[PDB]
Structure 1
Amino acid sequence: PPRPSSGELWGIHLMPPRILVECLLPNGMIVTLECLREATLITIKHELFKEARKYPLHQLLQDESSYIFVSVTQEAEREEFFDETRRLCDLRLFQPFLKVIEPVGNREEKILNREIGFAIGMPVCEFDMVKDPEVQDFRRNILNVCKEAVDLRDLNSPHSRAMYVYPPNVESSPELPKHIYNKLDKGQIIVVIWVIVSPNNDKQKYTLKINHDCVPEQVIAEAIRKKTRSMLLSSEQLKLCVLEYQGKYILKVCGCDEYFLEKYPLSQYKYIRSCIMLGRMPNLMLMAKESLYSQLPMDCFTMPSYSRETSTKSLWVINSALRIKILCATYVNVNIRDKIYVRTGIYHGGEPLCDNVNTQRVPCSNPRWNEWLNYDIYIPDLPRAARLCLSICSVKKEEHCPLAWGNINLFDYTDTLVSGKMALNLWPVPHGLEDLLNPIGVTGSNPNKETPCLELEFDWFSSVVKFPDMSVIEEHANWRENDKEQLKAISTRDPLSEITEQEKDFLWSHRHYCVTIPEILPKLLLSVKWNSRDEVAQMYCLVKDWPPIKPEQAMELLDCNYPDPMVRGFAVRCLEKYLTDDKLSQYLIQLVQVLKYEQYLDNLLVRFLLKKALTNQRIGHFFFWHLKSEMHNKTVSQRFGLLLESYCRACGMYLKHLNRQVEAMEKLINLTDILKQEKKDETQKVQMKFLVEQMRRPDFMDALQGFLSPLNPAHQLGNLRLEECRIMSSAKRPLWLNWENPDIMSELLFQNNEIIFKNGDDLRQDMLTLQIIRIMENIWQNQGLDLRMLPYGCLSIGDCVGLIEVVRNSHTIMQIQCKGGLKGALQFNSHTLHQWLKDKNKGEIYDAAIDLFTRSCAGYCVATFILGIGDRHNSNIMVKDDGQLFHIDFGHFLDHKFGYKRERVPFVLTQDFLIVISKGAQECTKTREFERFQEMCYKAYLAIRQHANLFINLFSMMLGSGMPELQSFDDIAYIRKTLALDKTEQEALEYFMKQMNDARHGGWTTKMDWIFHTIKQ
């Protein structure tokens, strides 16, 4: 089983500097050797065989090379330590002992399984023991997707492999927003190509002026032209030098691992477009194709060893109502301070298909029922996604209460219907669940067998029952004017808008015309009774012959409102065709969480994502971490573990890079665990003294130097600048970590890579927030609205563990006000923020710096309001030295939030920002600089309102994840108030202006208080 902590021994976080290891020699002798904590196995084995000569039967000892060490890990597996570089502390031992054996069997397979097992967080041997045939089928079958993807990787042998590792980071469309085309000089951009002349790295410049829509090969041609121009060549020779050397080189972003491999226009690449809008000069490095391909390993894909007349009727035949016997339950923990009963119900996802029947109330101490339950539903009327939800409950009719629950799929993954006796282990009811049934909870039996086990018997028929194939469904399915005004009005309604019985029947009646409006499919599917084969079969034929829709609209058909596989398969088929790899990376947070809803392990969605992950390493990288971060959860453990196994077995050589990341995080988790536990009541000095001493140790320096940042694996983390590393003030004990950038030309980009490792707080909320903020910025930018947001990187790697990208040269408003500028000591007042900004942007820099603030502030001001993250204070708002505003630490706000107040929200920092937007000016309440700022917010607020459906669907998909602020749709409904979707388009803007005016005037009056944020007013 996955080990609980990241300690070195079971129970002990850190080995003492000297450990007594009981070594089991291969002659049968046990000798106790005092090993150093950081000693490698090579040194331990060497000093062992020297001490072993003192003990009997030492003449039998062969050469040290002919033996390997074996021990038991904290996972309780027998790990054969083939890699003898690994240190004693990094072995994850249960108890300190080592066994000297001679290797048996296949060395390669042994290594790969431990590499995969370490990447997942659980050994592969556990999957081999799972007898569940669905699990073993998924494991065997899913390798088809792995081989398909590997064949595409090795299709264009050298180049396609480089595209896999270094996919072109580009925007979805080459079209340039109106304000971005204006920034470049009449259709062309200035670009600098660099060349490394010798191994003793020095550089040569080649400043070019190129059309923005040039392809990387054309950019190289212009660099060659500039060099060959200065040399004695004829027009034909200059022409030939370009032709014959265009395709021998390759471009790369100076200071990170981002390559221009594909023939996209240069402006479509994100680095260049970012350079264009910011006004920075792109610096690209000239590289040889023969140099990049030399670093590509050429990894192989080898199949593992787990890839090795019955009477049957159809379901469209059997005539009877659903009947289920509740045999007996093993035990129920009750106090005899209260009789108990079993409540059941047949559900189609969230919606129940029929009435919920109960069992007879039986004594508290005797748990037996043995009664055929008769549900109010017809068996052939069942859909494909029909499933049983039941639970054991108790009564004080006076006071009902559930104890243990459990859901089952009424149909197997084979399309077989349940038949006969079945034992089901139940799950415990979550902390915040008062419902008698838990219908949307995870489907299946509890792996933990030491829980209440309720047994039941299903109706056995003559033969084996199976759901009919689609061809049989088409047979049963076989059997105007102008009402187009309503269909096009409810199609543009947000998904959280109510659909009345008038409109549901009106949609079902006019469904054959709805094909002409394909975006109304989500509304139409809700307007169907899923307990009627008549209607279900007619929808099935419509779905298959349904026009493809936008991928943003198709993503809605994968949340908890559409459990039908034909509905999901359509959405996956839409994604397979139309969704770009860019938008895939954008919406990966939702797409991974959506996997949880799918009934079975093997399905169309996992096969789509896994192939794309095995085809694009930037997708696969975050696909890995998003899955691994949910391995702590038992409810998802099995599926995500099996899916991670599929990726790790096929991803290739990046598996080793991921292991280096895992090992690096494991070190950080354990180090923080010590600071949070054990060394809890120690001062900052002592813990920093411990940090410096412990980080300096060779096991830590080796583990956390020379690996790729999980926040962005294009950024390489070199050596630690330990002088900068420190523990942050927060009681959760975060780790500030600084790294040298080992890129050959880090000078021209990231000089320092700084990351915040925090162990304690849940970062899932920040991830989703920063994602939506990024999407909001994208929508504004494509509409020619320049509002510069800063969605800094954030990635959760486990249960309340993750990383945070550090923004350089940024300070909180609180930090800004601490300086003073030699105006006393700490004394400040509103104007100081502006004075600080002017004192650090002088000259003509000032004018552009003020512009950056207003644009960035307007974006966040609008965004925060729509989302409810507006009531922020000096500590949670940051300003860069150039003058870019951005809010931080969104999870802290969500943790600190009945339903009757909020009618008035005073923003005290309105006054401080108005002085920044408009220089000085005693009466800055209304200026020309302010009138511009307001219009920017108006344009933005309405722009998000136009794309409101996207954000609603984005949150709706994030309901599978167990977030306390995202459980029901009532939580998401808040956006409808801020955006005012029911109100008129013009009225919504009039509403917005009122909300802002109230917050402004409220800020003037209120007295803030600096530390505790308590308003005296």
Structure 2
Amino acid sequence: LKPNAATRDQLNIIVSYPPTKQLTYEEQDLVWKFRYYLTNQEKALTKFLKCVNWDLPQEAKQALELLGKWKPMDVEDSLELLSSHYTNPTVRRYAVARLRQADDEDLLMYLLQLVQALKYENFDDIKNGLQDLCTFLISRACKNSTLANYLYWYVIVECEDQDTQQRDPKTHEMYLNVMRRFSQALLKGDKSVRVMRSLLAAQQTFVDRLVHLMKAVQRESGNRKKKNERLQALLGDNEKMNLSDVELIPLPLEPQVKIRGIIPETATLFKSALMPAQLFFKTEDGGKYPVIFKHGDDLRQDQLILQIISLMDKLLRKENLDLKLTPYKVLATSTKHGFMQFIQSVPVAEVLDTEGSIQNFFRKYAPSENGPNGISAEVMDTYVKSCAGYCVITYILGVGDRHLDNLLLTKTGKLFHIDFGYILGRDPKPLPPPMKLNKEMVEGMGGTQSEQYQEFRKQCYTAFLHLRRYSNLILNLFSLMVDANIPDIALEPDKTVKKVQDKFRLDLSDEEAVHYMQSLIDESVHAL
């Protein structure tokens, strides 16, 4: 009923394990032995549930009894209970009950993964509904238009996934039923929610017309100039395409922004194989919102990565660390098209081509006599911070294919990464470095001889230690994606979480982790 110091230190280590680390039989025996002692530690609950044999009715019954008496786990920790590991309905309900306590802002941060988690729910319960996870998500969406917006588009992407339809038709049918349940709940509610239903329908019609227009532009066989002219001609013709002027609708990419149409004369096609469009949306308040609209292209890996980057940024900010990151919005409107929030910027490759150096760039657009190397101290501070943030973040996420056209710069000093087609250690070339810096970025802050290089290192340490403390949440979110139709995940689903977990070096104390991170940055820089 009570363990000794040696046992306590063992149980404490077990309780410290990452969420998807498998417990040995001995550890399962130990956690079970002292389950009553552990009811006062909310962090031990997930470990106890992992040691239960849910196929033995008497054991499951006792486990559920202890679940009711356990000090409730932190809301975030409940995401683990919605993974593929748990089929016991009372466990999965308990998770939903904890998630009910999260505010709308936090729930939005997990919503992408929770939609994936529907794959592990009871498909008959979802169908027969025409709180479990489906009921909960719909309930929250009917009370928050932003949640409704993302729930709708997340689920409609799943419904149009032809891979799921062929490979797992029952899961495809479930997602159809979720959409039916969602539509059912919206129509049933009050005027505010019924209005939401009409606005979602209006969004879908707008995207449909945009998709049709993109296809019409590409039926053309002319050069890029002729295609831009066609794109602008079809956009300016509101009567046929109805995209120049439409009733106010929430922008699916960022529904807080209401749009009235697309500005026809400024729409152009990117000079790239897939020829995505740059479009400027007319916002409700007379402004402009530029986006990239990709067609014939799967944005879902980018969508996940930008969502995780947004979360990591919010976590850092919550720890009072604003590293000036650029988590631009990404929203798939289907498996073959979607939106990206366009940030005015210049690729580092272009900076080098035209200015020769990042320092030359900053001196042209942010000069200051007595600033570091003649550059505005504010701009340099922003550069150092964002370099540090993306260094740690892209390291944890194993982002590959890091050429200088995928590193973008702003005249305010912000550096950020784009194009996340290679993640989790994948790379076009072999033997990719665990940490991927490049000479030009270090040179941008004045080289290793600058004070800025040490402040860069210090910010990496601080961000690394902060994100380490949220490893349970970050790993839990990735555990809910292991069965997702994401290329670099589906390529090795059973090793996906471990590949992120390893980056945290949770075997190392904070002090050792700082030394490790220092060694990593210096060694990466030494290689140049």
Q: Give TM-score, length-normalised by structure 2.
A: 0.88
Equivalence for 2:180: 642
Q: Which amino acid aligns with 2:513?
A: A
Q: In the alignment, what sits opposite 2:303?
A: 767
Does structure 1 residue 608 correspond to structure 2 residue 131? Answer: no
**Residue 993 of structure 1 is aligned with which of 518, 521, 525?**
518
- 2: CA distance between counterparts of 1:503 and 1:905? 34
Q: Distance in 2 between matches of 1:550 and 1:512?
A: 19
- Counterpart mapping for 1:764-843 below 5 A: 764-808=300-344, 810-820=345-355, 828=356, 832-843=357-368
Of residues 10, 13, 29, the one that matches 1:505 is 29
Establish whether residue 620 from structure 1 lines up as the match of residue 148 from structure 2.
yes
| 1:861–1:870 CA contact under 8 A, matched in 2 | no
Alignment counterpart, residue 494 of structure 1, candidates 8, 18, 25 = 18
CA contact (8 A) 1:795 1:803 kept: yes
Q: Is the 8 A contact 1:711 1:794 kept in 2?
A: yes
Matched, 1:737 2:279: yes
**Which residue of 372, 391, 409 maps to 1:861?**
391
Give the SS at the match of 1:961: coil
Report what 1:901 is aligned to: 431
Kindly tell me the number of residue pairs found equivalent between the two proteins. 497
Instruction: State how 1:234-273 maps to structure 2 within 5 Å.
Output: none
Q: Secondary structure at the match of 1:717?
A: strand
Instruction: Give yes or no for contact 1:627–1:644 (8 Å, CA) kept in 2.
Output: no
How far 1:492 sits from its partner (Å)?
1.5
Deviation of 1:991 (Å) = 2.2
Amino acid at match of 1:995: L
Contact 2:115 2:154 in 1 (8 A): yes
Aligned-pair CA distance for 1:905: 6.6
1:795 Cα deviation after fit: 0.5
Cα offset for 1:998?
2.2
Distance 2:134 2:229 in 1: 48
Task: Report the secondary structure of 2:489's partner residue.
Answer: coil
State how 1:848-997 maps to structure 2 within 5 Å: 848-869=378-399, 872-891=402-421, 897=427, 901-902=431-432, 907-908=437-438, 910=439, 912-918=440-446, 924-967=447-490, 968-997=493-522
User: Where do 1:619-698 residues align within 5 Å?
Assistant: 619-633=147-161, 634=165, 635-637=171-173, 638-649=176-187, 650=189, 651-676=193-218, 678-679=219-220, 681-698=221-238
Secondary structure, counterpart of 2:279 in structure 1: strand
Give the drift of 1:659: 2.3
- Aligned 8 A contact 1:727 1:736 in 2: yes
Which structure would you say has the larger Rg? 1
Could you tell me how far 1:779 is from its partner in structure 2? 2.3
Question: Is 1:546 aligned to 2:70, yes or no?
Answer: yes
Q: Deviations over 1:846-885 (max 9, x none)?
A: 1211111111111001111111115512100111121111
Q: Report the secondary structure of 1:973's partner residue.
A: helix
Tell me: CA distance 1:895–1:684, structure 2 relative to 1, closer, same or farther (3 Å): farther
**CA distance in structure 2 between the aligned counterparts of 1:904 and 1:775, rounded to whole angstroms:** 22
Separation in 2, partners of 1:871, 1:689: 33
Q: CA 1:581 to 1:937, structure 2 compared with 1: closer, same or farther past 3 Å?
A: same
Q: 1:656 to 1:523 in 2, by over 3 A?
A: same
Partner Cα separation in structure 2 for residue 805 and residue 675 of structure 1 = 22
Q: What is the Cα deviation at residue 896 of structure 1? A: 6.8
CA gap of 1:969–1:904, structure 2 versus 1, over 3 A, is closer
CA deviation string 1:495-545 (max 9, x = no partner): 232311111111122212221112212221221223322211211211233
1:721 aligns with 2:279: no
Taking structure 1 as reference, are residues 896 and 536 closer, same or farther at Cα in structure 2, changes over 3 Å only? Answer: closer
Residues 897, 934 of structure 1: alpha-carbon distance in 2 compared, 3 angstrom cutoff: closer
| Paired amino acid for 1:815 | E
SS of corresponding position for 1:540? helix
- CA shift, 1:640, in A, is 2.6
* CA displacement 1:700-724 (0-9 Å, x = unmatched): 5634533321111221223533221
Q: Is the contact between residue 817 and residue 833 of structure 1 (CA under 8 Å) also seen in structure 2? A: yes
CA distance in 2, matches of 1:573, 1:520: 18
User: Closer, same or farther in 2 for the Cα pair 1:592/1:494, shift >3 Å?
Assistant: same
Deviations 1:388-409 (A, max 9, x none): xxxxxxxxxxxxxxxxxxxxxx
Map of 2:54 onto structure 1: 530
Measured in 2, the distance between the counterparts of 1:543 and 1:594 equals 21
Q: How does 1:308-323 map to 2 (within 5 A)?
A: none
**Matches of 2:277 and 2:422, distance apart in 1:** 18
Q: 1 CA distance for matches of 2:92 and 2:238?
A: 51
**Residues 125-204 of structure 1 aligned to structure 2 (within 5 Å):** none
**Equivalent residue number for residue 272 of structure 1:** none
Q: Distance in 2 between matches of 1:563 and 1:999?
A: 44
1:519 to 20, 24, 43: 43
- Give the distance between the partners of 2:68 and 2:84, measured in 1 at CA: 21
What residue identity is the alignment partner of 2:352?
Q
Gap runs ≥5 in structure 1? 1-479, 821-827, 919-923, 1004-1017
Check the 8 A contact 1:628/1:640 in 2, yes or no: no
- After TM superposition, give the deviation of residue 969 of structure 1 in Å: 3.3
Q: How far apart are 1:617 and its partner, in Å?
A: 1.1
Mapped partners of 2:50, 2:24: distance in 1? 11
| 1:898, distance to aligned residue in structure 2 (A) | 11
SS class of match (2:278): strand
Q: Percent identity?
A: 28
